[PDB]
CSV table of C-alpha atoms in Angstrom, one decimal:
chain,number,residue,atom,x,y,z
A,1,UNK,CA,99.5,102.3,66.0
A,2,UNK,CA,96.5,100.4,67.2
A,3,UNK,CA,94.5,103.5,66.6
A,4,UNK,CA,95.7,103.5,63.0
A,5,UNK,CA,94.8,99.9,62.6
A,6,UNK,CA,91.4,100.4,64.1
A,7,UNK,CA,90.7,103.5,62.0
A,8,UNK,CA,91.9,101.7,58.8
A,9,UNK,CA,89.7,98.7,59.4
A,10,UNK,CA,86.7,101.1,60.1
A,11,UNK,CA,86.8,102.5,56.5
A,12,UNK,CA,87.1,99.1,54.8
A,13,UNK,CA,90.9,99.6,54.5
A,14,UNK,CA,91.8,96.4,56.3
A,15,UNK,CA,94.0,95.2,53.3
A,16,UNK,CA,96.1,98.4,53.7
A,17,UNK,CA,96.1,97.7,57.5
A,18,UNK,CA,97.4,94.2,57.0
A,19,UNK,CA,100.5,95.4,55.1
A,20,UNK,CA,103.5,97.4,56.5
A,21,UNK,CA,101.3,98.5,59.5
A,22,UNK,CA,100.6,94.9,60.6
A,23,UNK,CA,104.2,94.0,60.2
A,24,UNK,CA,105.1,96.9,62.4
A,25,UNK,CA,102.6,96.0,65.1
A,26,UNK,CA,103.8,92.5,65.1
A,27,UNK,CA,107.4,93.6,65.5
A,28,UNK,CA,106.5,95.9,68.3
A,29,UNK,CA,104.7,93.1,70.2
A,30,UNK,CA,107.4,90.6,69.6
A,31,UNK,CA,110.6,92.7,70.3
A,32,UNK,CA,109.2,95.4,72.5
A,33,UNK,CA,111.4,98.3,73.5
A,34,UNK,CA,114.4,96.1,74.3
A,35,UNK,CA,114.5,93.5,71.5
A,36,UNK,CA,115.4,90.9,74.2
A,37,UNK,CA,114.8,90.5,77.9
A,38,UNK,CA,117.8,90.0,80.1
A,39,UNK,CA,117.8,87.1,82.6
A,40,UNK,CA,120.1,87.4,85.6
A,41,UNK,CA,121.8,84.3,87.0
A,42,UNK,CA,123.8,83.8,90.3
A,43,UNK,CA,124.9,80.9,92.5
A,44,UNK,CA,122.8,80.0,95.6
A,45,UNK,CA,125.9,80.1,97.7
A,46,UNK,CA,126.4,83.8,96.9
A,47,UNK,CA,123.0,84.6,98.3
A,48,UNK,CA,123.8,82.5,101.4
A,49,UNK,CA,126.9,84.7,102.0
A,50,UNK,CA,124.8,87.8,101.9
A,51,UNK,CA,122.2,86.5,104.4
A,52,UNK,CA,124.9,85.2,106.7
A,53,UNK,CA,126.6,88.6,106.9
A,54,UNK,CA,123.2,90.1,107.6
A,55,UNK,CA,122.4,87.7,110.4
A,56,UNK,CA,125.9,88.1,111.8
A,57,UNK,CA,125.4,91.9,111.8
A,58,UNK,CA,122.1,91.6,113.7
A,59,UNK,CA,123.4,89.2,116.4
A,60,UNK,CA,121.0,86.4,115.5
A,61,UNK,CA,123.4,83.7,114.5
A,62,UNK,CA,124.8,82.5,111.2
A,63,UNK,CA,122.3,82.0,108.4
A,64,UNK,CA,124.7,79.4,107.0
A,65,UNK,CA,124.6,77.2,110.1
A,66,UNK,CA,120.8,77.0,110.2
A,67,UNK,CA,119.0,73.8,109.0
A,68,UNK,CA,116.9,74.1,105.9
A,69,UNK,CA,113.8,74.4,108.0
A,70,UNK,CA,115.2,77.0,110.4
A,71,UNK,CA,116.3,79.0,107.4
A,72,UNK,CA,112.8,78.6,105.9
A,73,UNK,CA,111.3,79.7,109.3
A,74,UNK,CA,113.4,82.9,109.5
A,75,UNK,CA,112.9,83.8,105.9
A,76,UNK,CA,109.2,83.4,106.2
A,77,UNK,CA,108.8,85.6,109.3
A,78,UNK,CA,110.9,88.3,107.5
A,79,UNK,CA,108.7,88.3,104.4
A,80,UNK,CA,105.7,88.5,106.7
A,81,UNK,CA,107.2,91.5,108.4
A,82,UNK,CA,107.0,95.2,107.8
A,83,UNK,CA,110.5,96.3,108.9
A,84,UNK,CA,113.3,96.7,106.4
A,85,UNK,CA,116.3,94.4,106.9
A,86,UNK,CA,119.6,96.3,106.5
A,87,UNK,CA,121.1,99.7,105.7
A,88,UNK,CA,124.3,101.3,104.6
A,89,UNK,CA,125.8,100.3,108.0
A,90,UNK,CA,126.5,96.7,106.9
A,91,UNK,CA,129.9,95.0,106.6
A,92,UNK,CA,130.0,94.1,102.9
A,93,UNK,CA,132.6,91.9,101.2
A,94,UNK,CA,133.3,92.7,97.6
A,95,UNK,CA,131.1,89.8,96.5
A,96,UNK,CA,128.2,90.8,98.8
A,97,UNK,CA,128.5,94.4,97.4
A,98,UNK,CA,128.3,92.9,93.9
A,99,UNK,CA,125.0,91.0,94.7
A,100,UNK,CA,123.3,93.9,96.4
A,101,UNK,CA,124.4,96.4,93.7
A,102,UNK,CA,123.1,94.0,91.0
A,103,UNK,CA,119.7,94.1,92.9
A,104,UNK,CA,119.8,97.9,93.0
A,105,UNK,CA,120.5,98.2,89.3
A,106,UNK,CA,117.6,95.8,88.6
A,107,UNK,CA,115.5,98.1,90.7
A,108,UNK,CA,116.6,101.1,88.7
A,109,UNK,CA,115.5,99.7,85.3
A,110,UNK,CA,112.2,99.2,83.6
A,111,UNK,CA,110.5,95.8,84.0
A,112,UNK,CA,110.3,95.1,80.2
A,113,UNK,CA,114.1,94.8,80.4
A,114,UNK,CA,114.1,91.6,82.5
A,115,UNK,CA,113.0,88.0,82.2
A,116,UNK,CA,113.9,85.7,85.1
A,117,UNK,CA,116.3,85.5,88.0
A,118,UNK,CA,118.0,82.1,87.9
A,119,UNK,CA,119.6,80.4,90.9
A,120,UNK,CA,122.5,78.2,89.9
A,121,UNK,CA,123.0,75.3,92.3
A,122,UNK,CA,119.5,75.4,93.6
A,123,UNK,CA,118.7,72.6,96.1
A,124,UNK,CA,116.0,73.7,98.6
A,125,UNK,CA,113.2,76.2,99.0
A,126,UNK,CA,115.3,78.5,101.2
A,127,UNK,CA,117.5,79.2,98.1
A,128,UNK,CA,114.4,80.6,96.3
A,129,UNK,CA,113.1,82.4,99.4
A,130,UNK,CA,116.4,84.1,99.9
A,131,UNK,CA,116.3,85.6,96.4
A,132,UNK,CA,112.7,86.8,96.7
A,133,UNK,CA,113.6,88.5,100.1
A,134,UNK,CA,116.7,90.2,98.7
A,135,UNK,CA,114.5,91.4,95.8
A,136,UNK,CA,112.0,93.0,98.1
A,137,UNK,CA,114.6,94.5,100.6
A,138,UNK,CA,116.6,96.0,97.7
A,139,UNK,CA,113.4,98.0,96.7
B,1,UNK,CA,143.8,132.5,101.7
B,2,UNK,CA,145.8,131.2,104.7
B,3,UNK,CA,148.6,130.3,102.3
B,4,UNK,CA,148.6,133.9,101.2
B,5,UNK,CA,148.6,135.1,104.8
B,6,UNK,CA,151.4,132.7,105.7
B,7,UNK,CA,153.5,133.6,102.7
B,8,UNK,CA,153.0,137.4,103.3
B,9,UNK,CA,154.1,137.1,106.9
B,10,UNK,CA,157.1,135.1,105.8
B,11,UNK,CA,158.6,138.0,103.9
B,12,UNK,CA,158.0,140.6,106.6
B,13,UNK,CA,154.8,141.7,104.8
B,14,UNK,CA,152.5,141.2,107.8
B,15,UNK,CA,151.3,144.8,107.6
B,16,UNK,CA,150.0,144.1,104.1
B,17,UNK,CA,148.6,140.8,105.4
B,18,UNK,CA,146.7,142.6,108.1
B,19,UNK,CA,144.8,144.8,105.6
B,20,UNK,CA,142.1,143.7,103.1
B,21,UNK,CA,143.4,140.1,103.4
B,22,UNK,CA,142.8,139.8,107.2
B,23,UNK,CA,139.4,141.4,106.7
B,24,UNK,CA,138.6,138.7,104.1
B,25,UNK,CA,139.8,135.9,106.3
B,26,UNK,CA,137.7,137.1,109.2
B,27,UNK,CA,134.6,137.4,107.0
B,28,UNK,CA,135.2,133.9,105.7
B,29,UNK,CA,135.5,132.5,109.2
B,30,UNK,CA,132.5,134.4,110.6
B,31,UNK,CA,130.0,134.0,107.8
B,32,UNK,CA,131.2,130.9,106.1
B,33,UNK,CA,129.6,129.6,102.9
B,34,UNK,CA,126.1,130.3,104.1
B,35,UNK,CA,126.2,133.7,106.0
B,36,UNK,CA,123.9,132.1,108.6
B,37,UNK,CA,123.1,128.6,109.9
B,38,UNK,CA,119.5,127.5,109.7
B,39,UNK,CA,118.0,126.0,112.9
B,40,UNK,CA,115.0,123.7,112.5
B,41,UNK,CA,112.1,123.7,115.0
B,42,UNK,CA,109.2,121.3,115.5
B,43,UNK,CA,106.7,120.3,118.2
B,44,UNK,CA,107.4,117.2,120.3
B,45,UNK,CA,103.9,116.0,119.7
B,46,UNK,CA,104.6,115.9,115.9
B,47,UNK,CA,107.5,113.4,116.5
B,48,UNK,CA,105.2,111.4,118.8
B,49,UNK,CA,102.7,111.0,115.9
B,50,UNK,CA,105.5,109.6,113.6
B,51,UNK,CA,106.7,107.1,116.2
B,52,UNK,CA,103.1,106.0,116.9
B,53,UNK,CA,102.4,105.3,113.3
B,54,UNK,CA,105.7,103.4,113.2
B,55,UNK,CA,104.9,101.2,116.2
B,56,UNK,CA,101.3,100.7,114.9
B,57,UNK,CA,102.7,99.6,111.5
B,58,UNK,CA,105.1,97.0,113.3
B,59,UNK,CA,102.3,95.6,115.6
B,60,UNK,CA,104.2,96.5,118.8
B,61,UNK,CA,101.6,98.9,120.3
B,62,UNK,CA,101.1,102.6,120.3
B,63,UNK,CA,104.2,104.7,121.1
B,64,UNK,CA,101.7,107.3,122.5
B,65,UNK,CA,100.3,105.0,125.1
B,66,UNK,CA,103.7,104.0,126.6
B,67,UNK,CA,104.9,105.6,129.8
B,68,UNK,CA,107.9,107.8,129.7
B,69,UNK,CA,110.1,105.0,130.8
B,70,UNK,CA,108.7,102.4,128.4
B,71,UNK,CA,109.2,104.9,125.6
B,72,UNK,CA,112.8,105.5,126.9
B,73,UNK,CA,113.3,101.7,126.9
B,74,UNK,CA,112.2,101.1,123.3
B,75,UNK,CA,114.0,104.1,122.0
B,76,UNK,CA,117.2,102.9,123.7
B,77,UNK,CA,117.1,99.4,122.3
B,78,UNK,CA,116.5,100.8,118.8
B,79,UNK,CA,119.5,103.2,119.0
B,80,UNK,CA,121.5,100.2,120.2
B,81,UNK,CA,120.3,98.1,117.2
B,82,UNK,CA,121.6,97.6,113.7
B,83,UNK,CA,118.4,97.2,111.8
B,84,UNK,CA,116.7,100.1,110.0
B,85,UNK,CA,113.3,101.0,111.3
B,86,UNK,CA,110.9,101.7,108.3
B,87,UNK,CA,110.7,101.9,104.5
B,88,UNK,CA,108.4,103.3,101.8
B,89,UNK,CA,105.8,100.8,102.9
B,90,UNK,CA,104.5,103.0,105.8
B,91,UNK,CA,101.1,104.7,106.2
B,92,UNK,CA,102.0,108.4,106.3
B,93,UNK,CA,99.6,111.1,107.2
B,94,UNK,CA,100.3,114.5,105.5
B,95,UNK,CA,102.0,115.7,108.7
B,96,UNK,CA,104.1,112.6,109.1
B,97,UNK,CA,105.2,113.0,105.5
B,98,UNK,CA,106.2,116.6,106.3
B,99,UNK,CA,108.4,115.5,109.3
B,100,UNK,CA,110.2,112.7,107.4
B,101,UNK,CA,110.7,114.8,104.3
B,102,UNK,CA,112.2,117.6,106.4
B,103,UNK,CA,114.6,115.0,107.8
B,104,UNK,CA,115.5,113.8,104.3
B,105,UNK,CA,116.1,117.4,103.1
B,106,UNK,CA,118.4,118.0,106.1
B,107,UNK,CA,120.2,114.8,105.0
B,108,UNK,CA,120.6,116.2,101.5
B,109,UNK,CA,122.4,119.4,102.5
B,110,UNK,CA,125.8,120.3,103.7
B,111,UNK,CA,126.4,120.4,107.5
B,112,UNK,CA,127.6,124.1,107.4
B,113,UNK,CA,124.0,125.0,106.6
B,114,UNK,CA,122.5,123.9,109.9
B,115,UNK,CA,122.7,124.9,113.6
B,116,UNK,CA,120.3,123.1,115.9
B,117,UNK,CA,117.1,121.0,115.9
B,118,UNK,CA,114.8,122.6,118.5
B,119,UNK,CA,112.0,120.6,120.1
B,120,UNK,CA,109.0,122.9,121.0
B,121,UNK,CA,107.1,121.7,124.0
B,122,UNK,CA,109.9,119.5,125.3
B,123,UNK,CA,109.1,117.8,128.6
B,124,UNK,CA,110.9,114.5,129.0
B,125,UNK,CA,114.0,112.7,127.6
B,126,UNK,CA,112.0,110.6,125.2
B,127,UNK,CA,111.2,113.8,123.3
B,128,UNK,CA,114.9,114.3,122.6
B,129,UNK,CA,115.6,110.6,122.0
B,130,UNK,CA,112.8,110.5,119.4
B,131,UNK,CA,114.5,113.2,117.4
B,132,UNK,CA,118.0,111.7,117.5
B,133,UNK,CA,116.5,108.4,116.4
B,134,UNK,CA,114.5,110.0,113.5
B,135,UNK,CA,117.8,111.8,112.5
B,136,UNK,CA,119.7,108.5,112.3
B,137,UNK,CA,116.9,106.5,110.5
B,138,UNK,CA,116.4,109.2,107.9
B,139,UNK,CA,120.1,108.8,106.9
């Protein structure tokens, strides 16, 4: 389309370019391939459950019990690390399976489909860091 | 087939059962769905390279430098563990990619297709433990 617009302007046919073609370019740029971008939203407590089952499965303690700065500390070291965090061998409640599966589906779809991941009931930086970490470790 | 054999014997038709039907059952049991079972064979040194790039990527040292008992020790703790070992983020030489990809292909195929994994140039238990660990961590 931009090739058409460029070419048309080249030959002094800009008025033709600024008709149906400009309207089309503007609609492409505004709506893209999806019309809209889906945001995802979930409670912070639902991410806390997932990390708590992870830390329980690794015999490190309960991610729920940790202070906000201990949580911050562990989350930081893990984002700095190079080792994956969990595998299929992981006790998953139905809810935890929902959270991880949502992350996998996000991972399976093109980026132009998604806007923002929104943490309901956010209160502390560890609530954001949890979500970034889950996003990385769900590929 | 066994239902046919059972039924035929029920009615005193065992002589009929012990003809073409018995030959067929025996061929099924002997050749199975693959005729043969593929063995896989690889050098021990080629597994050592893979674990050395893994330990280098995790800033733990060089798996090659470790004594046979230090190797044994690390391999044991990892098999005892519950955390996966590596992800896509891993510097892979062409050879290391071949070894991991062979393990993935093995993981993608039915068990009746495979006999044994054979370590050329085996010398010490850490050569076997390496292969068991790679088999588990390649799913």
